[PDB]
Design a binder for this molecule. Structure first.
Ligand SMILES: Nc1ncnc2c1ncn2[C@@H]1O[C@H](COP(=O)(O)OP(=O)(O)OP(=O)(O)O)[C@@H](O)[C@H]1O
Ligand SMILES: [Ca+2]
Length: 358
């Protein structure tokens, strides 16, 4: 019997079968409901938005509308994976610091609505660590909705040391939209937004030294790249390429007072037992789509080096497949023979209720 793995992202659901190397299904975490006086999920919801009301049930990584989430899961099982959920153990993911009641509700829905035979809920960043071949390290997981630093020791997250940056890929897209709009290219609508998201993913990068890179862009065309818009206009960008993701290191760029991702990484390590910090510094694993920017590992290496003790060995691991590391880690975990005893079964649920999930 094949187990399912579903990574419930703010931006994208990644779903598939345990044992596979990649998720079979990747689609936007959007539900379209009929306008009042029949529902759609993903690309089709966006396509038909003129007759629907769009819902975003995963906000900053936390599931906030259960009826809409049920529609996403229904779509995942029946339309994307083409399975009957009552026939498959199902591993779901959750954000770091997910409230206990939320995990319990996820469990209730899986058993009572979908009648899964068994299930488990794992923390996203922990799965990404496993996908890197490690059980000790500190993960920087940055997706569409939220960014976390999650230090992990001997296979388990250390919740007291988790840090959360309330900015991720959507904010970076929005910021690039603002920058390009001010330059005379109006990007405000959803169709325009998708174009800006694509520009971001294709052309943006993280500068090793932001001030140096600004100087280069001011004095040369060497950093310029062009992009043809759907209306046939060709837009050229230079410093916008690296100003956009610089926001991860300087959240003040979008008016946030927060520490940048290098600082939150360091702060997280400093909340951990002094005896494990050496191992965390040597095992900083990057996951999620917003860690895909060229240059980000080298910048992280530089910034952590500046904050850490001078003798400290620092290593950033940024796997090529890291857009899907969470899902992959779930696939690996759910495939382990020793994990099979860890599934919560429907029998156990019937006996004990949702609280069993902790
Ligand atoms: N090559 C790339 N460069 C920059 N950003 C990218 C790239 N590829 C994807 N992204 C961004 O990554 C985000 C999607 O990443 P991911 O699937 O990890 O997020 P998620 O799991 O849905 O969100 P979260 O974990 O925050 O709830 C989007 O904002 C997308 O634009
Ligand atoms: Ca994610």
């Amino acid at each position: 019997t094949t187990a399912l793995v579903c990574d419930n992202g703010s931006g994208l659901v990644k779903a598939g079968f345990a044992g596979d190397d990649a998720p079979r299904a990747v689609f936007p975490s959007i539900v379209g409901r009929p306008r009042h006086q029949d529902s759609y999920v993903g690309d089709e919801a966006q396509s038909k938005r003129g007759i629907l009301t769009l819902k975003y049930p995963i906000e900053h990584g936390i599931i906030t509308n259960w009826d809409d989430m049920e529609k996403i899961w229904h779509h995942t099982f029946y339309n994307e994976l083409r399975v009957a959920p009552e026939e498959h153990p199902t591993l779901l993911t959750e954000a770091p610091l997910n409230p206990k009641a939320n995990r319990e509700k996820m469990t209730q829905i899986m058993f009572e609505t979908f009648n899964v035979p068994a299930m488990y809920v794992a923390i996203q960043a922990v799965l990404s660590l496993y996908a890197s071949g490690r059980t000790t390290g500190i993960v920087l997981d940055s997706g569409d909705g939220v960014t976390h630093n999650v230090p992990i020791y001997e296979g388990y997250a250390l919740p007291h040391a988790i840090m959360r940056l309330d900015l991720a890929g959507r904010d970076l897209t929005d910021y690039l939209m603002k920058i390009l709009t001010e330059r005379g290219y109006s990007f405000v609508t959803t169709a325009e937004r998708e174009i800006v998201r694509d520009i971001k993913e294709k052309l943006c990068y993280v500068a090793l030294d932001f001030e140096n890179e600004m100087a280069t862009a001011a004095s040369s065309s060497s950093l310029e790249k062009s992009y043809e818009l759907p209306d046939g206009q060709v837009i050229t960008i230079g410093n916008e390429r690296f100003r956009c993701p610089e926001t991860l290191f300087q959240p003040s760029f979008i008016g946030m007072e927060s520490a940048g991702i290098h600082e939150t990484t360091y702060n997280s390590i400093m909340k951990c037992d002094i005896d494990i910090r050496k191992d965390l510094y040597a095992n900083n694993v990057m996951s999620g789509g917003t860690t895909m920017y060229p240059g980000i590992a080298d910048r992280m290496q530089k910034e952590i080096t500046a904050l850490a003790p001078s003798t400290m060995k620092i290593k950033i691991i940024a796997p090529p497949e890291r857009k899907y590391s969470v899902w992959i880690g779930g696939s690996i975990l759910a495939s382990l023979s020793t994990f099979q005893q860890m599934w919560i079964t429907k029998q156990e649920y019937d006996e004990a209720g949702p609280s069993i999930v902790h």
